[PDB]
Amino acid sequence: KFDIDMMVSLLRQENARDICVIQVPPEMRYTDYFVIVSGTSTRHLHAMAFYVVKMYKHLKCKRDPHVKIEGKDTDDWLCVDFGSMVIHLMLPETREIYELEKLWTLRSYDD
């Protein structure tokens, strides 16, 4: 299967400079897992995103529709939305300026 375990294994295999996972509660109508990962550079981000996407494509779930790769034109933030999990690849400055962690853990308790 293609699950968060496969996600984290692949990301650690390619050695993401930083990984974080959020368990999105069911009552929020987005997804199950919110993965946020930092990278060294835009080239690194593109490489790892392409790698994980190829792994998803080749692994399993033929009936599951294919998956976009969003943020290709931008250099500091890519994102891939899977059926039940969404990965946000970015750089340290983008991550610290968008503070997705506080947003997705403290839904209405931050600025």
Binding site: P26, R29, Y30, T31
Partner: protein, 217 residues
């Protein structure tokens, strides 16, 4: 006996067999989903499965501002304000992806259409998302909420003061002058309540529909 509006057909030349088939499907779906009795003005919480997610439900609570449509396509649009943003959703009653309809507060309003709540103050559309359901006695006429809302400045989505709308739930005296009311009376059309050929008698149709429903039971 509350016959849900969608069962009663709008008059036309369409064959009654079409309505029989549509009612068969509607009742056979009602056997799965309990569509409670409710009226325009009652607060409802609708739980629906989202295809965008993976088998995850979404709940929307709001005041039913309009009941429209007939047959299997019947809809009800209900309104609320979330973080100060007015949102309306038109829910299809018989959509296979509405998991539940809960009548949080069963009540009737002075009007059969509360579309003017768009132009009313935001307080009259605000309803706590987590409000608990109130209880009505098993044998009790549905309460009629005689609330008359206050409107915001005159530029409105529709000319609510005009007689053809027949709005009774707006405090017009507060927002409109006597001159404006008199001017709006120019569209009175008093004969329209007395032309007897315009009235749609649905007694026999309702009786037949009730027979069908009972037979389905």
């Amino acid at each position: 006996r509350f016959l849900s509006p969608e069962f009663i057909p709008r008059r036309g030349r369409t064959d009654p067999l079409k309505f029989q088939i549509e009612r068969k499907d509607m009742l056979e779906r009602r056997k799965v989903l309990h569509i409670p009795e409710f009226y325009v003005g009652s607060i409802l919480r609708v739980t629906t499965a989202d295809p965008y997610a993976s088998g995850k439900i979404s709940q929307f609570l709001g005041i039913c501002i309009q009941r429209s449509g007939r047959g299997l396509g019947a809809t009800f649009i209900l309104r609320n304000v979330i973080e100060g943003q007015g949102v309306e959703i038109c829910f299809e009653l018989y959509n296979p992806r509405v998991q539940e309809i809960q009548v949080v507060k069963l009540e009737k309003r002075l009007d059969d259409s509360l579309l003017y709540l768009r132009d009313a103050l935001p307080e009259y559309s605000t309803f706590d998302v987590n409000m608990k359901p109130v209880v009505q006695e098993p044998n009790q006429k549905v309460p009629v909420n005689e609330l008359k809302v206050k409107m915001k400045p005159k530029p409105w989505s529709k000319r609510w003061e005009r007689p053809n709308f027949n709005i009774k739930g707006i405090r017009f005296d507060l927002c409109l002058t006597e001159q404006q009311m008199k001017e709006a009376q120019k569209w009175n059309q008093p004969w329209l309540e007395f032309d007897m050929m315009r009235e749609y008698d649905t007694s026999k149709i309702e009786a037949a529909i009730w027979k069908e429903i009972e037979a389905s039971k």
